[PDB]
Ligand binder design. Sequence first.
Ligand SMILES: *[C@@H]1O[C@H](CO)[C@@H](O[C@@H]2O[C@H](CO)[C@@H](O[C@@H]3O[C@H](CO[C@H]4O[C@H](CO[C@H]5O[C@H](CO)[C@@H](O)[C@H](O)[C@@H]5O)[C@@H](O)[C@H](O)[C@@H]4O)[C@@H](O)[C@H](O[C@H]4O[C@H](CO)[C@@H](O)[C@H](O)[C@@H]4O[C@H]4O[C@H](CO)[C@@H](O)[C@H](O)[C@@H]4O)[C@@H]3O)[C@H](O)[C@H]2NC(C)=O)[C@H](O)[C@H]1NC(C)=O
Ligand SMILES: *[C@@H]1O[C@H](CO)[C@@H](O[C@@H]2O[C@H](CO)[C@@H](O[C@@H]3O[C@H](CO[C@H]4O[C@H](CO)[C@@H](O)[C@H](O)[C@@H]4O)[C@@H](O)[C@H](O)[C@@H]3O)[C@H](O)[C@H]2NC(C)=O)[C@H](O)[C@H]1NC(C)=O
Ligand SMILES: *[C@@H]1O[C@H](CO)[C@@H](O[C@@H]2O[C@H](CO)[C@@H](O[C@@H]3O[C@H](CO)[C@@H](O)[C@H](O)[C@@H]3O)[C@H](O)[C@H]2NC(C)=O)[C@H](O)[C@H]1NC(C)=O
Ligand SMILES: *[C@@H]1O[C@H](CO)[C@@H](O[C@@H]2O[C@H](CO)[C@@H](O[C@@H]3O[C@H](CO)[C@@H](O)[C@H](O)[C@@H]3O)[C@H](O)[C@H]2NC(C)=O)[C@H](O)[C@H]1NC(C)=O
Ligand SMILES: *[C@@H]1O[C@H](CO)[C@@H](O[C@@H]2O[C@H](CO)[C@@H](O)[C@H](O)[C@H]2NC(C)=O)[C@H](O)[C@H]1NC(C)=O
Ligand SMILES: *[C@@H]1O[C@H](CO)[C@@H](O[C@@H]2O[C@H](CO)[C@@H](O)[C@H](O)[C@H]2NC(C)=O)[C@H](O)[C@H]1NC(C)=O
Ligand SMILES: *[C@@H]1O[C@H](CO)[C@@H](O[C@@H]2O[C@H](CO)[C@@H](O)[C@H](O)[C@H]2NC(C)=O)[C@H](O)[C@H]1NC(C)=O
Ligand SMILES: *[C@@H]1O[C@H](CO)[C@@H](O[C@@H]2O[C@H](CO)[C@@H](O)[C@H](O)[C@H]2NC(C)=O)[C@H](O)[C@H]1NC(C)=O
Ligand SMILES: *[C@@H]1O[C@H](CO)[C@@H](O[C@@H]2O[C@H](CO)[C@@H](O)[C@H](O)[C@H]2NC(C)=O)[C@H](O)[C@H]1NC(C)=O
Ligand SMILES: *[C@@H]1O[C@H](CO)[C@@H](O[C@@H]2O[C@H](CO)[C@@H](O)[C@H](O)[C@H]2NC(C)=O)[C@H](O)[C@H]1NC(C)=O
Ligand SMILES: *[C@@H]1O[C@H](CO)[C@@H](O[C@@H]2O[C@H](CO)[C@@H](O)[C@H](O)[C@H]2NC(C)=O)[C@H](O)[C@H]1NC(C)=O
Ligand SMILES: *[C@@H]1O[C@H](CO)[C@@H](O[C@@H]2O[C@H](CO)[C@@H](O)[C@H](O)[C@H]2NC(C)=O)[C@H](O)[C@H]1NC(C)=O
Ligand SMILES: *[C@@H]1O[C@H](CO)[C@@H](O[C@@H]2O[C@H](CO)[C@@H](O)[C@H](O)[C@H]2NC(C)=O)[C@H](O)[C@H]1NC(C)=O
Ligand SMILES: *[C@@H]1O[C@H](CO)[C@@H](O[C@@H]2O[C@H](CO)[C@@H](O)[C@H](O)[C@H]2NC(C)=O)[C@H](O)[C@H]1NC(C)=O
Ligand SMILES: *[C@@H]1O[C@H](CO)[C@@H](O)[C@H](O)[C@H]1NC(C)=O
Ligand SMILES: *[C@@H]1O[C@H](CO)[C@@H](O)[C@H](O)[C@H]1NC(C)=O
Ligand SMILES: *[C@@H]1O[C@H](CO)[C@@H](O)[C@H](O)[C@H]1NC(C)=O
Ligand SMILES: *[C@@H]1O[C@H](CO)[C@@H](O)[C@H](O)[C@H]1NC(C)=O
Ligand SMILES: *[C@@H]1O[C@H](CO)[C@@H](O)[C@H](O)[C@H]1NC(C)=O
Lengths: 434, 118, 118, 118
Amino acid sequence: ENLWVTVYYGVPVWKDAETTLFCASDAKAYDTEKRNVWATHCCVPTDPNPQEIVLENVTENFNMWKNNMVEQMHTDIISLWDQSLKPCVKLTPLCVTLNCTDVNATNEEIKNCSFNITTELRDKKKKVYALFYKLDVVPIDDNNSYRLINCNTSAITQACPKVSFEPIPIHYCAPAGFAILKCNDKKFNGTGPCKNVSTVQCTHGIKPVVSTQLLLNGSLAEEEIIIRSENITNNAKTIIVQLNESVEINCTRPNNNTRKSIRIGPGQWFYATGDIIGDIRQAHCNISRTKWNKTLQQVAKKLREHFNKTIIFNPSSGGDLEITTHSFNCGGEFFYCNTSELFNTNNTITLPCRIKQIINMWQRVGQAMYAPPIEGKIRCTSNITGLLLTRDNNTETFRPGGGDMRDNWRSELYKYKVVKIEPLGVAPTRCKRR
Amino acid sequence: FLGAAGSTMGAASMTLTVQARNLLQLTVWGIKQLQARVLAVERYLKDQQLLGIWGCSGKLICCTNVPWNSSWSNKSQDEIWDNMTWMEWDKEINNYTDIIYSLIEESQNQQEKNEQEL
Amino acid sequence: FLGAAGSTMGAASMTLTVQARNLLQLTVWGIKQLQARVLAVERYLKDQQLLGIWGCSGKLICCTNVPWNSSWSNKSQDEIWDNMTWMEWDKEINNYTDIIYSLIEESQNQQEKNEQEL
Amino acid sequence: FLGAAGSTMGAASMTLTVQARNLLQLTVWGIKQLQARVLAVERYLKDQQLLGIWGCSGKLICCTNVPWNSSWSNKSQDEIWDNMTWMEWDKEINNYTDIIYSLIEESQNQQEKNEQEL
Ligand SMILES: *[C@@H]1O[C@H](CO)[C@@H](O[C@@H]2O[C@H](CO)[C@@H](O[C@@H]3O[C@H](CO[C@H]4O[C@H](CO[C@H]5O[C@H](CO)[C@@H](O)[C@H](O)[C@@H]5O)[C@@H](O)[C@H](O)[C@@H]4O)[C@@H](O)[C@H](O[C@H]4O[C@H](CO)[C@@H](O)[C@H](O)[C@@H]4O[C@H]4O[C@H](CO)[C@@H](O)[C@H](O)[C@@H]4O)[C@@H]3O)[C@H](O)[C@H]2NC(C)=O)[C@H](O)[C@H]1NC(C)=O
Ligand SMILES: *[C@@H]1O[C@H](CO)[C@@H](O[C@@H]2O[C@H](CO)[C@@H](O[C@@H]3O[C@H](CO[C@H]4O[C@H](CO)[C@@H](O)[C@H](O)[C@@H]4O)[C@@H](O)[C@H](O)[C@@H]3O)[C@H](O)[C@H]2NC(C)=O)[C@H](O)[C@H]1NC(C)=O
Ligand SMILES: *[C@@H]1O[C@H](CO)[C@@H](O[C@@H]2O[C@H](CO)[C@@H](O[C@@H]3O[C@H](CO)[C@@H](O)[C@H](O)[C@@H]3O)[C@H](O)[C@H]2NC(C)=O)[C@H](O)[C@H]1NC(C)=O
Ligand SMILES: *[C@@H]1O[C@H](CO)[C@@H](O[C@@H]2O[C@H](CO)[C@@H](O[C@@H]3O[C@H](CO)[C@@H](O)[C@H](O)[C@@H]3O)[C@H](O)[C@H]2NC(C)=O)[C@H](O)[C@H]1NC(C)=O
Ligand SMILES: *[C@@H]1O[C@H](CO)[C@@H](O[C@@H]2O[C@H](CO)[C@@H](O)[C@H](O)[C@H]2NC(C)=O)[C@H](O)[C@H]1NC(C)=O
Ligand SMILES: *[C@@H]1O[C@H](CO)[C@@H](O[C@@H]2O[C@H](CO)[C@@H](O)[C@H](O)[C@H]2NC(C)=O)[C@H](O)[C@H]1NC(C)=O
Ligand SMILES: *[C@@H]1O[C@H](CO)[C@@H](O[C@@H]2O[C@H](CO)[C@@H](O)[C@H](O)[C@H]2NC(C)=O)[C@H](O)[C@H]1NC(C)=O
Ligand SMILES: *[C@@H]1O[C@H](CO)[C@@H](O[C@@H]2O[C@H](CO)[C@@H](O)[C@H](O)[C@H]2NC(C)=O)[C@H](O)[C@H]1NC(C)=O
Ligand SMILES: *[C@@H]1O[C@H](CO)[C@@H](O[C@@H]2O[C@H](CO)[C@@H](O)[C@H](O)[C@H]2NC(C)=O)[C@H](O)[C@H]1NC(C)=O
Ligand SMILES: *[C@@H]1O[C@H](CO)[C@@H](O[C@@H]2O[C@H](CO)[C@@H](O)[C@H](O)[C@H]2NC(C)=O)[C@H](O)[C@H]1NC(C)=O
Ligand SMILES: *[C@@H]1O[C@H](CO)[C@@H](O[C@@H]2O[C@H](CO)[C@@H](O)[C@H](O)[C@H]2NC(C)=O)[C@H](O)[C@H]1NC(C)=O
Ligand SMILES: *[C@@H]1O[C@H](CO)[C@@H](O[C@@H]2O[C@H](CO)[C@@H](O)[C@H](O)[C@H]2NC(C)=O)[C@H](O)[C@H]1NC(C)=O
Ligand SMILES: *[C@@H]1O[C@H](CO)[C@@H](O[C@@H]2O[C@H](CO)[C@@H](O)[C@H](O)[C@H]2NC(C)=O)[C@H](O)[C@H]1NC(C)=O
Ligand SMILES: *[C@@H]1O[C@H](CO)[C@@H](O[C@@H]2O[C@H](CO)[C@@H](O)[C@H](O)[C@H]2NC(C)=O)[C@H](O)[C@H]1NC(C)=O
Ligand SMILES: *[C@@H]1O[C@H](CO)[C@@H](O)[C@H](O)[C@H]1NC(C)=O
Ligand SMILES: *[C@@H]1O[C@H](CO)[C@@H](O)[C@H](O)[C@H]1NC(C)=O
Ligand SMILES: *[C@@H]1O[C@H](CO)[C@@H](O)[C@H](O)[C@H]1NC(C)=O
Ligand SMILES: *[C@@H]1O[C@H](CO)[C@@H](O)[C@H](O)[C@H]1NC(C)=O
Ligand SMILES: *[C@@H]1O[C@H](CO)[C@@H](O)[C@H](O)[C@H]1NC(C)=O
């Protein structure tokens, strides 16, 4: 019974921790021509035959709202975009009076504007033309005199014409001494214990898809719609709804664009929209009516379990386009689609969409980007895998939320927790040093 | 790796060599990883230094002086090594971690190094 | 340093202390060297950790359990220690490097540590 | 920490674990600290490597072969351990630091490792 202290090293125990994770990818199928920002060539390959260890007889408390993997992913993305755009052409020389008239889409939103631009030789300026979308241009006068919307606030960096921003699944992997725990309870929602817990080197690939009302291309729930919130009784919180069935969206940019290269300096090129070829048509997105109807009704049914009120949906209440419309990127183009027909037969719901080139991503007002035009036509296929909803009676009203991108990552990282291994410990034995 | 986390404390003694084995441009993307590498080394060395102080540098299982307090644990070995897991154990001892380490360090070294020269 | 590279394996045993001894602005010019310093430390520690696992941490010459396979080497010592150099030797064993190491870690460590407590 | 600096050499032997224990953005402000951390590790490892070579890796007090020279010190222990402090001592031996170290590495290691295999 005369038990003594014995030191054991290599004890299989852990403590919660916050550390630096690294970027890893599955495929190295990406070339150097595309220069995808998520194929940085600074991101390592992951394990082609990854292991997962089931931890039996353990319980672990997971919390998607206080999870630090989300903050780190958010930070990495902002940093990545700023670095990728760092060396590219600045468009401050374009903050000149624009002489604009409507394009010959006559008997809307595209303006034909004239500029006075300094050429490679500083003594001369050339008069040139470009087409702009109405959303990017603000009038100065009541006359045909306009300015770009950013000159009032910030300088524009032109997106690098050779850099793809197409999402590539990224795995976030632990550094030595750390491990990632995964929750395998199919019905795990927000915060609380998970009974089926396993250990992995790293997460599944997560596509860094940016959208504001409908979450796209994520992972579906295994059995039913799962509703996740930090505090479901707080109307100020976002409710993340994970669908157990996807709904497809077909989006397009139906007019044929051309690209006009304008020199604005000594090796400094500006890419302007050139003439539109053929008909001028409005951008749009197609959602099957029958799939949407059953999906939205199932969401109302599941939401009801937490409120016991009749649930209805409404169009968003207002704000700028990033919040009021379904903002998303597709093909490198930036779409803002009107969803009033969703949040409200056998037809297809066709949502009109608008497109804009001068962008202030992640609410970082003061850092504008110009998205150069893409020649030809654009066709997108995507999956709605979830919704971001907010709330305002014997009824309750839900509206699209979004804007703050961390909510789009909590929806994939809710299953993961980072812990550190603390292998040194003590237990009793009759064994003594001598 | 942590396969033994759900196993009992005794059984888990076979994996000490597993748990103890995986401990080893100018941009933020890169500097944060360099900092992580330096930290991994520092954490490794701190554990090795402490084992050296306790006279446990070459051992995964190291018996020391310092008997157990009933205030730390009054549980029999029948449960500790045969039924409990290491996580469960850590949850019972935790508060005494610093106390035990201090007692080992301040006893085991002074009472051996002098006696050996003499 | 490597003076013994052309010497036979036995003679070269006198230089183990030599070969084992030299193992320790915001510009790329300097960051690459900071990274090199960190790597030198990491390589050093990985070799020390492995020797510790095998029970060889304090030794340059460390006898272990695990007999030799005729599939690894069928030469007598008359050739191995007296005529061959270490480069020549490494060129013949190479394919079995991982095999031999696994056989020490999975044997020499587990069969000594449990027995010592007992 | 250095509380024993004014104490005699013998008394100071009780603080060896004190003195030996505290050895572990893209801006200059931060890079210089990262460099300092790497250096602290390198200095630590160099002392540990040297003790390993001398066969003193597990010891704070380590007896070796190599008798004392009257050219190094002609004092009796009555003065060295009981009246002198370690600073005073270092000030008298200093010139022979490299000599003594070479005499341990070239003797204590080679004459023990070959003999142990044999
Ligand atoms: C949710 O997930 C979905 C599914 O991944 C996302 O939807 C995808 O989005 C992709 C990017 O927008 C889109 O990829 C573009 O598709 C265009 C149409 O391609 C048709 O033809 C190909 C033929 O395939 C064969 O050839 C290719 C060539 O590389 C090979 O790679 C294949 O293996 C085959 O051998 C079919 O496979 C398609 O199904 C279509 O029928 C392509 O034209 C386009 O490529 C051009 O743009 C690239 C931009 O990075 C560029 O790298 C590439 O080199 C091409 O550019 C050349 O041509 C242009 C013309 O103007 C020129 O300016 C350039 O200088 C250069 O010369 C892409 O491949 C996926 O097809 C699409 N998937 C579906 C099902 O629609 C969805 O976006 C995502 N959700 C969100 C919100 O992101
Ligand atoms: C958007 O508008 C673009 C500009 O009009 C369209 O590009 C045109 O597409 C047509 C249909 O494929 C091409 O016609 C073919 O041309 C080839 C020969 O091409 C080569 O010679 C021409 C001579 O001018 C040269 O311009 C090309 O670069 C090639 O060197 C013929 O063999 C075919 O039989 C057929 O006539 C046009 O040539 C092409 N124009 C250009 C400038 O490339 C584009 O297709 C439209 N996009 C969409 C989605 O509608
Ligand atoms: C998304 O599309 C919807 C339509 O499906 C847009 O709502 C419509 O917005 C127009 C704005 O001019 C409304 O017209 C105005 O209505 C008020 C009503 O008092 C009237 O006084 C004005 O003279 C004018 O007629 C229109 O009624 C409204 N439709 C509905 C059904 O309310 C919505 O604005 C679009 N949102 C975005 C972000 O694009
Ligand atoms: C949107 O969601 C749909 C499902 O609702 C996805 O369709 C499914 O895609 C997977 C591929 O990840 C298909 O699995 C494999 O397809 C290959 C095709 O040759 C087959 O050989 C394999 O054995 C396996 O079936 C799956 O069948 C397909 N499901 C259906 C009903 O077509 C779609 O990929 C998602 N993404 C987009 C952008 O549409
Ligand atoms: C608990 O989670 C583990 C995963 O950590 C589940 O194990 C997987 O089960 C599927 C079933 O077909 C296998 O295909 C996978 O290969 C298994 N993975 C691993 C790592 O073993 C397990 O089934 C879950 N148990 C419960 C009750 O949900
Ligand atoms: C550019 O500005 C001018 C005037 O500010 C616009 O009007 C033209 O003015 C010149 C002056 O001599 C006349 O000769 C032209 O006939 C005027 N145009 C028309 C249609 O009457 C001109 O239209 C503006 N251009 C753009 C692209 O806005
Ligand atoms: C800069 O823009 C101004 C107008 O915005 C150009 O001035 C016009 O130039 C034409 C050339 O024939 C004249 O006919 C117009 O009467 C001028 N407008 C005014 C208001 O005077 C000016 O030429 C442009 N600079 C360059 C280098 O093209
Ligand atoms: C320059 O920027 C300021 C804000 O920084 C603009 O002021 C508001 O802009 C919004 C944008 O639609 C309008 O709805 C508000 O009505 C504007 N405020 C006022 C008091 O009118 C300002 O309008 C921008 N410059 C121009 C020419 O529009
Ligand atoms: C999943 O939803 C359930 C509710 O159906 C959560 O239950 C908790 O219940 C206690 C009871 O007092 C409340 O105080 C907690 O606030 C509820 N949690 C939450 C997050 O609201 C359960 O915790 C949810 N999450 C998980 C992972 O089980
Ligand atoms: C969600 O947050 C809201 C935030 O207000 C909590 O509800 C109110 O909290 C205030 C705090 O002073 C109380 O005075 C109110 O009486 C609370 N309202 C109600 C209806 O009780 C709410 O309790 C939080 N919910 C959860 C599940 O934590
Ligand atoms: C979105 O586009 C896809 C194809 O890009 C449509 O899928 C086609 O649907 C028709 C319906 O009869 C099938 O015959 C085709 O074979 C399908 N194509 C493929 C490649 O499978 C889908 O129906 C469209 N969705 C909407 C809402 O229009
Ligand atoms: C999780 O707990 C269960 C229940 O105790 C373990 O299964 C049995 O444990 C008893 C304990 O003495 C053994 O005698 C039985 O033989 C075990 N069952 C089997 C089928 O062997 C289970 O092993 C525990 N999990 C782990 C990882 O050990
Ligand atoms: C290189 O090979 C030569 C030839 O074997 C070595 O020289 C002789 O090696 C034999 C081997 O038994 C010794 O008995 C002789 O005494 C060696 N010659 C002399 C002059 O001593 C030579 O030493 C080898 N190189 C090295 C570095 O050992
Ligand atoms: C500093 O020197 C003084 C003077 O020697 C030390 O005090 C005495 O030292 C003698 C040496 O044999 C002891 O016998 C006395 O007992 C010491 N005095 C007391 C009051 O104990 C003093 O201790 C030295 N400083 C330190 C840190 O030891
Ligand atoms: C989840 O999708 C499956 C697809 O077959 C469907 O049967 C099931 O009813 C859906 N879950 C809910 C809650 O409807
Ligand atoms: C959409 O909402 C508006 C709100 O005014 C309503 O008038 C309209 O009838 C609704 N459309 C559908 C299809 O419910
Ligand atoms: C147990 O704790 C008490 C607290 O005063 C202490 O006196 C006693 O010596 C301790 N026993 C052991 C085994 O350390
Ligand atoms: C030699 O290799 C064979 C391959 O099966 C193995 O069975 C045998 O035990 C090995 N001998 C040694 C000494 O490991
Ligand atoms: C003392 O120094 C002399 C210098 O020649 C040397 O010969 C002698 O061996 C040394 N004694 C010791 C103990 O090393």
